[PDB]
Design a protein around this ligand. Sequence first.
Ligand SMILES: [Zn+2]
Ligand SMILES: [Zn+2]
Lengths: 188, 188
Amino acid sequence: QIRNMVEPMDPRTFVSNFNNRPILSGLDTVWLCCEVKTKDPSGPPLDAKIFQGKVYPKAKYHPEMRFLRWFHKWRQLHHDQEYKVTWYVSWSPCTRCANSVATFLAKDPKVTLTIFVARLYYFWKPDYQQALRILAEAGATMKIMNYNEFQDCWNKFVDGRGKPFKPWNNLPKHYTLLQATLGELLRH
Amino acid sequence: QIRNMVEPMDPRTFVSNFNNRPILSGLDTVWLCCEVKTKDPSGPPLDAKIFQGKVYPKAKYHPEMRFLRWFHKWRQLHHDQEYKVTWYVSWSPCTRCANSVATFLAKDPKVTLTIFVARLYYFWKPDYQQALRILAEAGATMKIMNYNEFQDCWNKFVDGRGKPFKPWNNLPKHYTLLQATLGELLRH
Ligand SMILES: [Zn+2]
Ligand SMILES: [Zn+2]
């Protein structure tokens, strides 16, 4: 049970940065909730951690970059086998980071990433639209966080204090918008 | 010109009821701006009108239903030829209105409708989704109002007032959302 493997983030912090209002400003931070497993989806969570970084460049200090460096040294300490990573990230990847995660997934065919985004990041600038396409073109499975993944993220990475998940009104309103957007953007 | 054929609506009313923030309810009414034309769209508009209806049932007082009765009476006064109707309605259609318009478009292969919605109405509830999916059958061309269609509507149906149309913030961002949602819902 990964609640001990990580240093769970604050409830007032989660409700703020994982709010899925598609157009939102005032959140300068992107929170990545990481989780490593084997080619199995049914066994134990093998390792887990929470990265965070601020959005202004350099992109070398972004929570998807902190992951890529961490997972490089971590892959060394464990045996060569197929891994299944999955992210619960607050904002979608930026443009430079999407290129890094693509070069990574390309070199290393044993890992297969799955990113759940709470919000799509600059879904209107066409640079960021091809960033999402770059990822799904490298093998990364891109999805929108729905009620289950918001809940499953609360249980696993928060000071839940046994408290159960409290969903805001307009969650599936925003979900239907964001899924359909990600659906159109990835379409080719 | 058609600013003369109708009873132009108020400027403060148009920005109010045609604002395209995908999520809205503080809005009790639905506004339908109609326009009938010939086979050739490069000709002038034959007639035009503004309907109104409150959003609560029965659907008999919905602005797309007042049209269906009005257009039946108007059809008689002219010779039979092919009409190209186009709506600029603020909310998308409800479920029962969509049945009317589908069966209506079915009786008369000479009419071809084009509906421009400013917002999708209850785009998350699953029946209101096959609601748009009906009109898509029986031929209705479904589209989202982008800036051009908002502008063209101000010109034709709004008491211009000698002040220019000022488009509201995030209009083409909201367009991306609603355009993506509608697109996915119609293939679904
Ligand atoms: Zn980045
Ligand atoms: Zn109706």
